[PDB]
Amino acid sequence: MLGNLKPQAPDKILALMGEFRADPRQGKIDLGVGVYKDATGHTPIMRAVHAAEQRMLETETTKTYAGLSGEPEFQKAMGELILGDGLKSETTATLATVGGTGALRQALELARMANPDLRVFVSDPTWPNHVSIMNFMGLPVQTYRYFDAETRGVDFEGMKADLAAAKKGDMVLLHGCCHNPTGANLTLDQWAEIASILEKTGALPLIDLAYQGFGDGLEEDAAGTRLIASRIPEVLIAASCSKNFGIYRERTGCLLALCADAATRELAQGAMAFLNRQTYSFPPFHGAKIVSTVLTTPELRADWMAELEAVRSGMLRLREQLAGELRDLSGSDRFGFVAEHRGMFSRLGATPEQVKRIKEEFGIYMVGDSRINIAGLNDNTIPILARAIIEVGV
Amino acid sequence: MLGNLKPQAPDKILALMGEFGKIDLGVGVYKDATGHTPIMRAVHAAEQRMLETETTKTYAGLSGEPEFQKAMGELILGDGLKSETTATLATVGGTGALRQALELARMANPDLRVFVSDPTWPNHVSIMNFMGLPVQTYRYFDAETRGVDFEGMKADLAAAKKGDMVLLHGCCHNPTGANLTLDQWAEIASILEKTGALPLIDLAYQGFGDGLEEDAAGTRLIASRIPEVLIAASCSKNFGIYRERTGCLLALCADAATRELAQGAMAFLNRQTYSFPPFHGAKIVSTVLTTPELRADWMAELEAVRSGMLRLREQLAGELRDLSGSDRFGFVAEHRGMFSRLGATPEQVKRIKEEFGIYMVGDSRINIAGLNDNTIPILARAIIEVGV
Numbered sequence: 159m160l161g162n163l164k165p166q167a168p169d170k171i172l173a174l175m176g177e178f179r180a181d182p183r184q185g186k187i188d189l190g191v192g193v194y195k196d197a198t199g200h201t202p203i204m205r206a207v208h209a210a211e212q213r214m215l216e217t218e219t220t221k222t223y224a225g226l227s228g229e230p231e232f233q234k235a236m237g238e239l240i241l242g243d244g245l246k247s248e249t250t251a252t253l254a255t256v257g258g259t260g261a262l263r264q265a266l267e268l269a270r271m272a273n274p275d276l277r278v279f280v281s282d283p284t285w286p287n288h289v290s291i292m293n294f295m296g297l298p299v300q301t302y303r304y305f306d307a308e309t310r311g312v313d314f315e316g317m318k319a320d321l322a323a324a325k326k327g328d329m330v331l332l333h334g335c336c337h338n339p340t341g342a343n344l345t346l347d348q349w350a351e352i353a354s355i356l357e358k359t360g361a362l363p364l365i366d367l368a369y370q371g372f373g374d375g376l377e378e379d380a381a382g383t384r385l386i387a388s389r390i391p392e393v394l395i396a397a398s399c400s401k402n403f404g405i406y407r408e409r410t411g412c413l414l415a416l417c418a419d420a421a422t423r424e425l426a427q428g429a430m431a432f433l434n435r436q437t438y439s440f441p442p443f444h445g446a447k448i449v450s451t452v453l454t455t456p457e458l459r460a461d462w463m464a465e466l467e468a469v470r471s472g473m474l475r476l477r478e479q480l481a482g483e484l485r486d487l488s489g490s491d492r493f494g495f496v497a498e499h500r501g502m503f504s505r506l507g508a509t510p511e512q513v514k515r516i517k518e519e520f521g522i523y524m525v526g527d528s529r530i531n532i533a534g535l536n537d538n539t540i541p542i543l544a545r546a547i548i549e550v551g552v
Numbered sequence: 553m554l555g556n557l558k559p560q561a562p563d564k565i566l567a568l569m570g571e572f573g574k575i576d577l578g579v580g581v582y583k584d585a586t587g588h589t590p591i592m593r594a595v596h597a598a599e600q601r602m603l604e605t606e607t608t609k610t611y612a613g614l615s616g617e618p619e620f621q622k623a624m625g626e627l628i629l630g631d632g633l634k635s636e637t638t639a640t641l642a643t644v645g646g647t648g649a650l651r652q653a654l655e656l657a658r659m660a661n662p663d664l665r666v667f668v669s670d671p672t673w674p675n676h677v678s679i680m681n682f683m684g685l686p687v688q689t690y691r692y693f694d695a696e697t698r699g700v701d702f703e704g705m706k707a708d709l710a711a712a713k714k715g716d717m718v719l720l721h722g723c724c725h726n727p728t729g730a731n732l733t734l735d736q737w738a739e740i741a742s743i744l745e746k747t748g749a750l751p752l753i754d755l756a757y758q759g760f761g762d763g764l765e766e767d768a769a770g771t772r773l774i775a776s777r778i779p780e781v782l783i784a785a786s787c788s789k790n791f792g793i794y795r796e797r798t799g800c801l802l803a804l805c806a807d808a809a810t811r812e813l814a815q816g817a818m819a820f821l822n823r824q825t826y827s828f829p830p831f832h833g834a835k836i837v838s839t840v841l842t843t844p845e846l847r848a849d850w851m852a853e854l855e856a857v858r859s860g861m862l863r864l865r866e867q868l869a870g871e872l873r874d875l876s877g878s879d880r881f882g883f884v885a886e887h888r889g890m891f892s893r894l895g896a897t898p899e900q901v902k903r904i905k906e907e908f909g910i911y912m913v914g915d916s917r918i919n920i921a922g923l924n925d926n927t928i929p930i931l932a933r934a935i936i937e938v939g940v
């Protein structure tokens with residue numbers, strides 16, 4: 159029977175890593191990495207996190223089944239970290255998921271459960287996993303203009319025009335901050351306008367928030383999300399803890415469902431818990447317990463925020479440098495967007511041909527769409543990348 | 553939009569604990585003499601070693617770590633592990649392994665039906681209902697003898713067709729406590745082979761019946777006869793890591809070509825569901841299994857738990873015979889695993905919970921691990937008073 163299985167395409171990350179590994183070039187560089195890497199090229203375990211695991215090891219007396227939709231401490235701490243004082247517990251449903259991806263999958267299952275004729279609107283471009291899951295679910299997908307290949311910024315007028323075609327009950331997927339893969343983001347004023355279009359169309363916003371604390375700051379990065387929450391009656395937020403906590407493999411995230419009434423909330427929580435139940439019963443405990451420990455323990459929380467800010471500040475300075483080196487070599491602004499972008503990713507606007515030429519002539523590797531990971535740059539690699547970008551004629 | 557949501561039915565077994573002198577004989581978790589579910593020594597030691605050895609937490613394998621996958625395959629199939637034709641997938645507990653098993657089978661056969669035992673773990677039917685899969689049942693429990701109705705089981709299983717999936721509990725049958733012998737397993741293998749039915753084995757209590765190796769005996773027999781088989785394994789109970797959510801799906805194929813197919817489709821299933829599987833619990837399992845000293849202590853601790861429960865069952869049967877002189881409740885001693893279904897009806901069950909304060913699943917399923925020297929006489933009395 160299993161022989162009738164259709165061949166499924168690999169993870170691709172492997173192919174990139176295999177091509178790169180095969181490269182005999184002593185000076186090859188890898189900007190395709192999708193995780194944070196420090197100056198030495200490592201993805202360290204944050205101090206606060208290692209401190210939480212030591213504490214957990216000393217306090218946990220059992221490992222019996224716990225909360226089906228997560229532990230109260232985690233749900234509460236997450237909603238506060240995301241919505242801040244605006245957290246309206248009375249109308250908020252929460253679900254511990256298996257990473258932000260689990261949160262996205264559940265959110266989609268929830269919405270479709272409420273509206274079978276659900277349509278999803280995704281940005282152009284967006285994280286490929288978005289489309290993958292949606293295709294796998296057989297949901298209709300529409301695209302809305304977003305990245306401007308010429309300016310490397312947001313084509314807002316285009317986005318508005320396309321979003322204007324959403325109907326009541328449709329879903330609009332928005333990256334809360336640090337757009338992956340582009341790095342081009344919305345201003346708080348652009349968020350206000352998007353909010354108006356959403357109220358007008360009656361479309362349901364789904365926010366993919368996986369990089370809170372990597373853009374302009376913990377609070378600053380949630381500004382757009384908070385604006386949507388306060389003006390839109392129903393909002394779905396899929397949050398991740400893999401990156402801003404550095405616990406990728408622990409698989410920790412959560413689905414937040416903001417509802418109009420308390421009755422509607424009771425409904426949503428019941429459907430979410432039911433969803434977890436029908437997929438894998440209980441969500442993973444370890445990673446979520448680390449997070450709630452860091453956030454509830456003053457000492458740890460303070461250390462986490464400090465370490466996270468150090469990371470953010472570092473990448474931002476890497477942006478300033480690359481843009482400066484590019485300013486000098488080009489003798490023009492052109493590449494100024496590099497310093498204007500936020501997140502650990504940036505789309506250079508290079509064509510596939512140029513990307514291939516950069517790799518062959520300079521040994522630098524990046525995703526085929528010209529996406530580079532800022533964290534992979536340093537005092538030694540920046541001059542090389544700059545020269546390569548200019549040399550290939552981007 | 554969310555207002556359209558219809559209310560969903562609660563998990564009965566988990567709701568049971570909601571209504572919780574008080575004697576909990578519900579949820580299938582192991583508990584010691586003082587009513588606690590401890591962390592196993594080896595497990596704790598593994599975590600400490602893990603705390604010192606792990607330097608990063610970056611994304612890892614989409615199908616789980618090679619070490620975990622290998623340790624699990626060896627634990628389950630032993631020397632009958634033909635890696636060349638076996639696909640492995642780390643999952644979110646045994647339930648996760650189950651869900652992925654049904655999804656995989658459905659991709660291969662959009663026209664599949666599932667045969668489940670009467671009775672079976674309620675979560676089996678709920679998941680199948682949710683997926684919209686046709687469910688047929690096969691006789692298994694003999695209501696009067698509290699044993700297996702084997703003739704009835706064979707008759708029903710023979711009605712299966714090529715492409716159908718037969719769900720068999722590998723050992724310690726939840727919720728009955730009744731289990732097939734190795735001679736019955738061979739006969740089942742005969743029926744399956746003839747019909748071309750794909751068996752899905754739910755293995756959640758390996759180590760709680762007669763022993764680690766002995767409890768995998770049936771699964772190994774089917775794996776050696778049937779060319780294609782699916783096994784969903786849970787490490788929740790035998791490792792005492794319930795909340796970590798760790799298990800795995802094994803897809804045994806007739807050849808490496810099909811194996812590469814299943815392996816690819818299995819990984820894809822994780823990617824499109826939650827991306828990567830949870831690492832912590834799987835790391836503990838592989839650490840314990842590949843560290844001779846740890847494996848040794850875990851086997852010993854599990855062994856102790858095993859024999860302990862076995863003794864409790866004997867106490868139950870005994871005390872109960874002192875209250876009748878009849879071998880009516882003898883089945884308690886025969887049943888193997890954590891559970892045992894008494895012949896009590898719902899009314900009787902209620903009388904017990906209300907006028908005796910002892911909470912058991914509404915079908916007479918009791919978790920023997922909940923009993924002890926102090927409560928056995930009380931429970932023995934309870935079911936005698938209520939007359940069952």
Ligand SMILES: *Cc1c(COP(=O)(O)O)cnc(C)c1O
Pocket residue numbers: 256257258259260285338366368398399400401406409410411826827
């Ligand atoms: C990382 C990421 C996620 C979620 O990652 P998880 O590893 O599942 O926590 C979701 N959306 C985007 C855009 C991401 O970059």
Ligand SMILES: *Cc1c(COP(=O)(O)O)cnc(C)c1O
Pocket residue numbers: 438439580644645646647648673726754756786787788789794797798799
């Ligand atoms: C425990 C159990 C499972 C799976 O449990 P998980 O906590 O999801 O690992 C599956 N089937 C049966 C019969 C079980 O008792």
Ligand SMILES: O=C(O)CCCc1cccs1
Pocket residue numbers: 191192193259285287338827828
């Ligand atoms: O590089 C990125 O887009 C972030 C990596 C996140 C993930 C990749 C595959 C599954 S989750």
Ligand SMILES: O=C(O)CCCc1cccs1
Pocket residue numbers: 439565566578579580581647673675726
């Ligand atoms: O008690 C049982 O039947 C199994 C353990 C409890 C569980 C219910 C759902 C997933 S695990």
